[PDB]
Amino acid sequence: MIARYQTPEMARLWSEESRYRMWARVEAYALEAWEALGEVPKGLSARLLAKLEEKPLDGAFARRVAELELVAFTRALAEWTGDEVGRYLLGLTSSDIVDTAQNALLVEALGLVLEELKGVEEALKALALRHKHTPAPTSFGLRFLSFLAAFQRDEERLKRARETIGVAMLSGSVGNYAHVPPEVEAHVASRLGLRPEPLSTQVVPRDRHAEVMAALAILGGNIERVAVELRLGLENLTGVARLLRGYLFPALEDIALDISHSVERVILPDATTLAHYALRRLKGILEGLVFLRHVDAIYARFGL
Amino acid sequence: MIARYQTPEMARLWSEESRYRMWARVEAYALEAWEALGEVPKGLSARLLAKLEEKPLDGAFARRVAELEAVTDLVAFTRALAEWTGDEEVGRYLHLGLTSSDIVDTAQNALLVEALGLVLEELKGVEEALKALALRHKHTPAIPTSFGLRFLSFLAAFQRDEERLKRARETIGVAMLSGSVGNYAHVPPEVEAHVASRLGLRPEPLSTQVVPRDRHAEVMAALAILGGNIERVAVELRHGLENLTGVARLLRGYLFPALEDIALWHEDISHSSVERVILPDATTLAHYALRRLKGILEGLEPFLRHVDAIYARFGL
Amino acid sequence: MIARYQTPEMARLWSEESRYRMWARVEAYALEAWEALGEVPKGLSARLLAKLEEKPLDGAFARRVAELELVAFTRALAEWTGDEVGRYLLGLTSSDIVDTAQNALLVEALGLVLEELKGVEEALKALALRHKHTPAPTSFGLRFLSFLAAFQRDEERLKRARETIGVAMLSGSVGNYAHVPPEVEAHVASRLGLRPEPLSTQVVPRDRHAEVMAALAILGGNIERVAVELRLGLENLTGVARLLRGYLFPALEDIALDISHSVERVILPDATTLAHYALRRLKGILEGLVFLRHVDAIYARFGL
Amino acid sequence: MIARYQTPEMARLWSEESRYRMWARVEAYALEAWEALGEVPKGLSARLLAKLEEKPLDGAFARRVAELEAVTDLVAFTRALAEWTGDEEVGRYLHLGLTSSDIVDTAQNALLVEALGLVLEELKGVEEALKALALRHKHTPAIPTSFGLRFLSFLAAFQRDEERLKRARETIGVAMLSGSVGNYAHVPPEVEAHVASRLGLRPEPLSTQVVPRDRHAEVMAALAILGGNIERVAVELRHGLENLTGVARLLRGYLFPALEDIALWHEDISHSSVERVILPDATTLAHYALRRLKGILEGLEPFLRHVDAIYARFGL
Numbered sequence A, C: 001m002i003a004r005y006q007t008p009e010m011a012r013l014w015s016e017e018s019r020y021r022m023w024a025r026v027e028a029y030a031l032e033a034w035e036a037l038g039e040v041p042k043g044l045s046a047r048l049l050a051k052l053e054e055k056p057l058d059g060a061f062a063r064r065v066a067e068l069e070l071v072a073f074t075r076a077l078a079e080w081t082g083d084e085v086g087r088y089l090l091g092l093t094s095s096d097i098v099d100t101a102q103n104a105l106l107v108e109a110l111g112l113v114l115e116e117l118k119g120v121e122e123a124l125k126a127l128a129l130r131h132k133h134t135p136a137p138t139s140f141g142l143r144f145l146s147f148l149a150a151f152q153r154d155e156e157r158l159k160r161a162r163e164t165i166g167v168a169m170l171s172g173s174v175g176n177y178a179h180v181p182p183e184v185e186a187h188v189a190s191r192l193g194l195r196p197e198p199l200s201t202q203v204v205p206r207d208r209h210a211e212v213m214a215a216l217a218i219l220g221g222n223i224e225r226v227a228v229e230l231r232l233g234l235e236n237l238t239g240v241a242r243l244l245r246g247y248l249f250p251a252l253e254d255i256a257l258d259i260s261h262s263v264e265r266v267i268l269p270d271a272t273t274l275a276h277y278a279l280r281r282l283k284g285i286l287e288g289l290v291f292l293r294h295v296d297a298i299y300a301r302f303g304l
Numbered sequence B, D: 001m002i003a004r005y006q007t008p009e010m011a012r013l014w015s016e017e018s019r020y021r022m023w024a025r026v027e028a029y030a031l032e033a034w035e036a037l038g039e040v041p042k043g044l045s046a047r048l049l050a051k052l053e054e055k056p057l058d059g060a061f062a063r064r065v066a067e068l069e070a071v072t073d074l075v076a077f078t079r080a081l082a083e084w085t086g087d088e089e090v091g092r093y094l095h096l097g098l099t100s101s102d103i104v105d106t107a108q109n110a111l112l113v114e115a116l117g118l119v120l121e122e123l124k125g126v127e128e129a130l131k132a133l134a135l136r137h138k139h140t141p142a143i144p145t146s147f148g149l150r151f152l153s154f155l156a157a158f159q160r161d162e163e164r165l166k167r168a169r170e171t172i173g174v175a176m177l178s179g180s181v182g183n184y185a186h187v188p189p190e191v192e193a194h195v196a197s198r199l200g201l202r203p204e205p206l207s208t209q210v211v212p213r214d215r216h217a218e219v220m221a222a223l224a225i226l227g228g229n230i231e232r233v234a235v236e237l238r239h240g241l242e243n244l245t246g247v248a249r250l251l252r253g254y255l256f257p258a259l260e261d262i263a264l265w266h267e268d269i270s271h272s273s274v275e276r277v278i279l280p281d282a283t284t285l286a287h288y289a290l291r292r293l294k295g296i297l298e299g300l301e302p303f304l305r306h307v308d309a310i311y312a313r314f315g316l
Helices: A008-013 A014-034 A043-056 A058-066 A072-080 A094-130 A143-167 A181-194 A207-230 A235-254 A265-288 A295-300 B008-014 B018-034 B044-054 B059-069 B074-084 B088-093 B100-136 B148-172 B188-200 B214-238 B239-261 B275-301 B307-313 C008-013 C016-036 C043-056 C059-068 C069-079 C094-130 C142-165 C182-192 C205-228 C237-256 C264-288 C295-300 D008-015 D016-036 D044-056 D059-069 D072-084 D088-093 D098-136 D148-172 D187-200 D213-237 D240-263 D273-297 D307-314
Strands: none
Touching: A008 A094, A008 A265, A008 D213, A014 A043, A014 A058, A014 A072, A014 A094, A014 A181, A043 B018, A094 A143, A094 A181, A094 A207, A094 A265, A143 A207, A143 A295, A143 B148, A143 B214, A207 A235, A207 A265, A207 B148, A207 B214, A207 B239, A235 A265, A235 A295, A235 B214, A235 B239, A235 D273, A265 D240, B008 B018, B008 B275, B018 B044, B018 B059, B018 B074, B018 B088, B018 B100, B018 B188, B044 B074, B044 B088, B044 D072, B059 B074, B074 B088, B074 B100, B100 B148, B100 B214, B148 B214, B148 B307, B214 B239, B214 B275, B214 C264, B239 B275, B239 C237, B239 C264, B275 C237, C008 C094, C008 C264, C016 C043, C016 C059, C016 C094, C016 C182, C043 D016, C059 C069, C094 C142, C094 C182, C094 C205, C094 C264, C142 C205, C142 C295, C142 D148, C142 D213, C205 C237, C205 C264, C205 D148, C205 D213, C205 D240, C237 C264, C237 D213, C237 D240, D008 D059, D008 D098, D008 D273, D016 D044, D016 D059, D016 D072, D016 D088, D016 D098, D016 D187, D044 D072, D044 D088, D044 D148, D059 D072, D072 D098, D098 D187, D098 D213, D098 D273, D148 D213, D148 D307, D213 D240, D213 D273, D240 D273
16 A cells, blocks of 8 residues: 555554564464463463563564565574574464464454544534534534434444454364364463454454455445535545445455455555545544534434 | 346335335325324324225236326325325325435335345244254264364354344334435424334434435445355355355445445435345345255264364354 | 336347247257258258248247246247257257357347447537537537547447457357367358357356456446536436446456356346446437637547 | 565556656656747757666655655656756746646556556466467367367467457557646647657547546456456466465456546546556556466366367467
């Protein structure tokens, strides 16, 4: 995604470095649970976490991994902490590590989109109150309340998408816990603020990703609506809405299937970052913006 | 839609006759509320409702509306309804503040709530067939695993579609009877509240001229994710099904216009093809695909240390 | 497709009855070629064609086929002419018959879309000439010339789509002519105004259908442009443009694969009929519609 | 786009540096035409062109444009170009009737002609690999047929993509230097004709402020059909390839905004993300997928009475 349509928070969240740090946390929390089960020496996971706190994974780690090209990553992780750790990375698959980390990242990304949505929601509330008794014959305020009601529906949809995607898969080769006790997954889930994936195969099911992307595409349409109604930088918000519709189509195709889903490396980071960018741009525009006898009853439905 | 890929329930639900019957119920229930407010003579609303139970609007009523439309859509409909009931006293009391959109959007939301009920019924059928195959195959070894686990993966995905479709049904299940600009200037909120309750809907807490189209887009999006879960079963079974795969492609195509309609339907109810095509077609294809998939699943009939526990998360 | 957005020409072309009549023509022309090769009694194909000319396949034929539910169709065809014909229907597959007939129908449908496009092209030419020296400071005429140039590009794209789709497959079970001499296909192609499909499998390749649908989606966008620029019944033309974009996506997915492509029964008839409807509606709107020193050089590029 | 799914040729072509170099060529060639018309001093255009050969615009030039943009895009670019050449005499002679869109759309069409050349080169590589596998397998029996025929089906489909991509390249290969409203009021048609010829393009026979976006949509549509033919090979080989299937899904997604842009880009060149994302991404993914597919085909290595004749339609 080109820098003009990026937020600093999304650029950091979706960087190489941030993915490796999340991978490392999954590995460390898994080791911690194996330790409770007698399968890794006491103190090995505390040592990896202490060392990550002291020397966070950065560009030099990421370049170093791009050379050895999860074997490359685990070698680079053991080498970059100078450590035993190598032998104990035991039953988990690549997909367990990578899909769990991506879920964690997507939970964070949706938290950023919700934070900005709340800003747009607050600006529309304020505009709707300010213009509650402004004549237009109707209240000019009702228009902003219509936007608010749509964004509140988007909030509900984005919170449900966040609950659906917030799962940890640490289930081993075919997803039946033969090589990794369910306790490992339960522990890693808990440490990441996720819940255990109640039924995984080799992968997390992609109806979960599709609900996230569909929530973003519906949010884009509501951003578009405000922008088209305001035109009383809106080529920008309509542009983002078209990309969000485009990005949804590969996620809908990914439902049926392994890894045939390039696709997620592009669409999840790009749609979450365009959503964040667009709501921030829309908040700025709303902050700098300019027969009635049932208006109070209508406002009351929104506690206004 | 082609008779080959319809269900009798969706063919009836989305028929013209069915639409006019729902237009008529919306006018009737509105009349009842207007009666209670002393704006229509006592016993009229109840006489219209008894006439529409006694002589259901059918094909002959639909032809009359079509003829009348050649020469004007709700003028044509209200005039056919007056003439078909045989009571021109009703005629003055229709549209008494209600817009075309109040009737058409309200009736379409009631039809969409029903259509989603039919899809949820058939999804329940698909869920029970998947519980049956998972129970049958719980101890069946395959490649070194329980063959049954695959059916539980399908089941979990369709239980999420079920939650998604129940939320879409709650979101779409709104009545708009708010008059010209949606501010109740010419129609007191009690009319909308009474018609909503009589239809099993809730009031649209804020309409413009139209119900907001993020509600419609949530429905079409739920159906497209469902289509993917239907497709996923058909593909994993391939290892009939060309049909289920086909429906999934059409459901993805039909979603695109609903996503464009969000920004765009309040500048269509009357002059645009988009919703007349995609909402009956997407709901019909979903119902059809779930029925066909249910038929196919019903036709079908040491390393496993954790299978009992996995099955217990599903209550199996 | 609902009647409001149908043309009479497209309703007839895409009816059950019209499909059966095209099926029967493919069968008859195949018999004619087998006859030249000594494989069917002389005069059998002339007898089937004579009988079809005299009693064209109609509702009573179509209902009669919907009962016996290409076995049903061939029985119903032999029964409905009271005839030998049964035994001689020999090497051709269902797909040979059905895919060849659908190509023929799509060539006709594209001929209808081109006929209406020429009407829109003529109206824009006329409007551009009428307003060539009308000031707006620029010629008000140039706007109509921009529309014309786009529609002329659509014409070129729709004529190329018509050439790509205009193929006949009569190649037998796996497409290698083992059970049907290439002469049969060459003869049927010639009789239908098609060319032989130079390389078929069990089916005609679907990049051909996808080019047709993509041409229609690009035509829809240009119809949309005129409608949005005119708003100086256009919810109708913008609506059709959204359906044409939607219909393209299943045809793009159909490229890769057998018959997993319901999909074509819906999208080919619906997109060709919405295209025909929309251009006819757009022609009617254009017919009833209201610094300069290089205008003549610009008009000259279009021979105006 | 991610380095994993790029080619070195597309990474260079779509770089900022590459865009600024093409902006600079468009300004230079326009200056030459303005010189011939006696509106810029003799030898200036030729001195700018020799300076841009002697000191190619690189990363340091791009940083300067970015800094300058923080404080205004073509003011920032024309000011960086004046300062980087060391000649403020040039500065007065830039934008001398040319719009931002004349430069930006013209440069983007020249980059799109190159990008399509790279895709066509790599498609030629895929075609030769398919001719090789068809020749190898001409007499190889499979299931009762020639195994080689399958490669000829792939080849025929990619020969159609080739025709489609050459037509898309002709359609996009237009120069717009027509000034404010596209009527040449402030820039004589000889400027556009001279820059077109110097770029290997033809004049846009009728522009507004912008090149019409059916041209861009034809390009994106050709790439999405190509993606389907790439996908079809990967799926029929499955019977690596998750990668080629992945690219086909993104190419279908990227097309949707280009189809919406037709009605819609002349009310974006400057304030919208859509083309900055989809045109470099779709052309890069196509080039990448064709290169990967070519590597894989190169790695790979009585009822047949009509095979020689079928092969002869392909000249094999």
